Amino acid sequence: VDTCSLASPASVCRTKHLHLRCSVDFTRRTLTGTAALTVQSQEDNLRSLVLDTKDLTIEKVVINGQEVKYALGERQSYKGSPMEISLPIALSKNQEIVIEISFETSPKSSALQWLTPEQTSGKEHPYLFSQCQAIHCRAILPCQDTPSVKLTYTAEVSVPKELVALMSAIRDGETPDPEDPSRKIYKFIQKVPIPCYLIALVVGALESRQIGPRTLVWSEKEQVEKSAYEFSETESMLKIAEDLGGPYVWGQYDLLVLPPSFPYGGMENPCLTFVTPTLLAGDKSLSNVIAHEISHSWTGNLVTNKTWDHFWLNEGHTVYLERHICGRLFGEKFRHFNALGGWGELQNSVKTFGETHPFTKLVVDLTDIDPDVAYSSVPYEKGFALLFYLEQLLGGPEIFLGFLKAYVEKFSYKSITTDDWKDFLYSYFKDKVDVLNQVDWNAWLYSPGLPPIKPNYDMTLTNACIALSQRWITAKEDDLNSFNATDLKDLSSHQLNEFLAQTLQRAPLPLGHIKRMQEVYNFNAINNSEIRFRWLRLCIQSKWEDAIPLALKMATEQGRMKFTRPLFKDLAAFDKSHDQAVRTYQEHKASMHPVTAMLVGKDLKVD
Ligand SMILES: N[C@H](CO)Cn1nnc(-c2ccc(Oc3ncc(Cl)cc3F)cc2)n1
Ligand SMILES: [Yb+3]
Numbered sequence: 215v216d217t218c219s220l221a222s223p224a225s226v227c228r229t230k231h232l233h234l235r236c237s238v239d240f241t242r243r244t245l246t247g248t249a250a251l252t253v254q255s256q257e258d259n260l261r262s263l264v265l266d267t268k269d270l271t272i273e274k275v276v277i278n279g280q281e282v283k284y285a286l287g288e289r290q291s292y293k294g295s296p297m298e299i300s301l302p303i304a305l306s307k308n309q310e311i312v313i314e315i316s317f318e319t320s321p322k323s324s325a326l327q328w329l330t331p332e333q334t335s336g337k338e339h340p341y342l343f344s345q346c347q348a349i350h351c352r353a354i355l356p357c358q359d360t361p362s363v364k365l366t367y368t369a370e371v372s373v374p375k376e377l378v379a380l381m382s383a384i385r386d387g388e389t390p391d392p393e394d395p396s397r398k399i400y401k402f403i404q405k406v407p408i409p410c411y412l413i414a415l416v417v418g419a420l421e422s423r424q425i426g427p428r429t430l431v432w433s434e435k436e437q438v439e440k441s442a443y444e445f446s447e448t449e450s451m452l453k454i455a456e457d458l459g460g461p462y463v464w465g466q467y468d469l470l471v472l473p474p475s476f477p478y479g480g481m482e483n484p485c486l487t488f489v490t491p492t493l494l495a496g497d498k499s500l501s502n503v504i505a506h507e508i509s510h511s512w513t514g515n516l517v518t519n520k521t522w523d524h525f526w527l528n529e530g531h532t533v534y535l536e537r538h539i540c541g542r543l544f545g546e547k548f549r550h551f552n553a554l555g556g557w558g559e560l561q562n563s564v565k566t567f568g569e570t571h572p573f574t575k576l577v578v579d580l581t582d583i584d585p586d587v588a589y590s591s592v593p594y595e596k597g598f599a600l601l602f603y604l605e606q607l608l609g610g611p612e613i614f615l616g617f618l619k620a621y622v623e624k625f626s627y628k629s630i631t632t633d634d635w636k637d638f639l640y641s642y643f644k645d646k647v648d649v650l651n652q653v654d655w656n657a658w659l660y661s662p663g664l665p666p667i668k669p670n671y672d673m674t675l676t677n678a679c680i681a682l683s684q685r686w687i688t689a690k691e692d693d694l695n696s697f698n699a700t701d702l703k704d705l706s707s708h709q710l711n712e713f714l715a716q717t718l719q720r721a722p723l724p725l726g727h728i729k730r731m732q733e734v735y736n737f738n739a740i741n742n743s744e745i746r747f748r749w750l751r752l753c754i755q756s757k758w759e760d761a762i763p764l765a766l767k768m769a770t771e772q773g774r775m776k777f778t779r780p781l782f783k784d785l786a787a788f789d790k791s792h793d794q795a796v797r798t799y800q801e802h803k804a805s806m807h808p809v810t811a812m813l814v815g816k817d818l819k820v821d
């Protein structure tokens with residue numbers, strides 16, 4: 215049972231294919247077209263079925279060349295409206311039919327962000343991008359919006375001829391639009407069955423540069439060069455990910471560097487990963503996000519969570535693989551440094567939510583919960599900590615990597631629950647069931663708060679971060695002059711980020727300490743988005759008024775929720791900036807990504 219979907223479940227009928235024919239209208243901010251769904255009945259005498267929709271205008275439903283009756287139910291908040299269609303003739307089990315729905319999206323579609331020319335790098339053309347995870351595909355097209363159903367897809371997208379369309383599929387040609395010579399139709403094909411949250415679309419003045427045998431980097435012209443350098447390690451990471459998870463089956467691995475308002479660090483859209491431009495640090499230091507999106511080609515896109523209650527299966531296994539790729543490239547000490555950092559981020563989330571909060575559980579219950587509101591680091595890091603604890607318990611990385619590859623092969627092209635994963639883990643590790651039975655499964659999977667056991671981490675790279683952090687925390691006014699730029703000379707950007715993360719966990723620090731830190735370390739000059747975010751949070755939480763314009767600018771010049779949400783919350787919690795934070799949100803709200811605007815509004819308690 216998928217409590218986030220109002221559609222007929224996979225036990226009633228399954229969508230096998232989607233043929234999408236649509237036109238992107240930038241003047242009306244609409245996507246208009248037909249969604250032809252090939253649906254297979256799973257029951258005898260099937261006479262109707264229900265699909266998910268959200269703010270879609272339905273023109274008609276055609277089956278067998280004739281219009282059929284359909285009805286839209288009452289809207290159910292974030293779930294949208296159910297769409298029940300009456301089939302013209304009763305279907306037997308395993309019988310397939312094609313249902314073509316003529317539809318149009320609302321300009322306020324929660325899946326899309328429509329950008330005016332002024333909001334782009336080039337300033338001449340508008341831009342459109344989608345973000346369907348978790349349940350926003352129903353705000354683009356009528357569908358069984360649940361990851362328990364996997365389908366293939368084809369698409370034909372008509373856009374103004376000067377613009378380029380890309381999808382989470384192999385590019386299958388382009389032609390001038392026969393109905394309008396000012397437009398082009400771009401064609402796409404996704405031959406691997408995917409859950410519908412992996413359907414993606416971008417339309418903009420895009421250019422590409424090849425960076426590997428199976429990778430093009432796409433962005434607006436102004437970002438192509440920087441992006442090609444930033445993501446040059448992509449092919450090396452794909453080769454390591456193939457060694458760990460088995461064959462890459464998607465053909466192409468392209469990257470799209472979105473405009474700054476892209477709400478996440480990355481989105482593992484098959485064939486075309488979407489990434490935030492905030493990764494463009496200039497030194498490849500934020501490339502673990504690419505390793506994470508690459509990892510999703512096995513964990514998430516091949517083996518998918520059956521419902522959003524088992525989302526930890528997607529992220530925990532992906533973080534586990536991501537950290538192995540980064541450990542293959544930079545060493546086992548580095549994999550331990552990243553794993554220990556992840557534990558610290560898990561501490562932060564559990565502190566923020568509270569140790570008894572239902573969203574700190576590994577397996578969650580999203581009945582009447584908007585998945586967007588539930589989103590946090592818990593499925594990522596508590597999921598990772600579980601797998602890292604099992605790796606140590608079961609004999610090391612080489613043994614657990616053998617399980618991981620067999621897990622991916624076992625469940626490729628399927629949607630699974632925590633019980634399916636746990637059963638396979640016990641089957642694979644049959645000779646270690648006595649060891650597995652020592653795990654407190656009820657606490658690990660179903661209890662809130664920090665896990666009952668903390669794994670063993672190598673501290674080599676972390677020690678200098680903890681030591682410098684503790685020097686600053688225990689310093690008094692007469693110790694401030696001992697600090698100097700030389701304190702950071704043997705620290706990598708990762709170690710500087712971990713120093714700030716350790717210090718931010720004990721914030722606020724005295725204002726004089728923060729001012730001294732800017733005096734000697736000049737953290738205000740750092741463009742690296744992770745370091746700048748933590749330093750600005752440290753400044754605002756330590757009540758430095760000078761940091762208010764810097765934090766407001768960072769929160770609005772980009773829109774990656776990881777940065778924008780805590781920056782606005784810190785600005786709202788500081789009395790000196792409270793009114794400015796609320797006013798800035800109000801004046802930027804209309805131009806923000808719809809999901810980000812909703813979440814910042816909830817965080818700020820502004821309706
Ligand atoms: N997947 C990308 C990383 O590569 C980044 N990303 N983009 N969108 C999303 C996204 C994921 C889940 C979600 O809802 C849930 N959150 C938490 C839980 Cl325990 C269950 C849920 F259903 C809402 C949004 N994650
Ligand atoms: Yb072709």
Ligand SMILES: [Yb+3]
Binds near residue numbers: 640
């Ligand atoms: Yb079993």
Ligand SMILES: [Yb+3]
Binds near residue numbers: 690692693
């Ligand atoms: Yb002293």
Ligand SMILES: [Zn+2]
Binds near residue numbers: 506510528
């Ligand atoms: Zn992920």
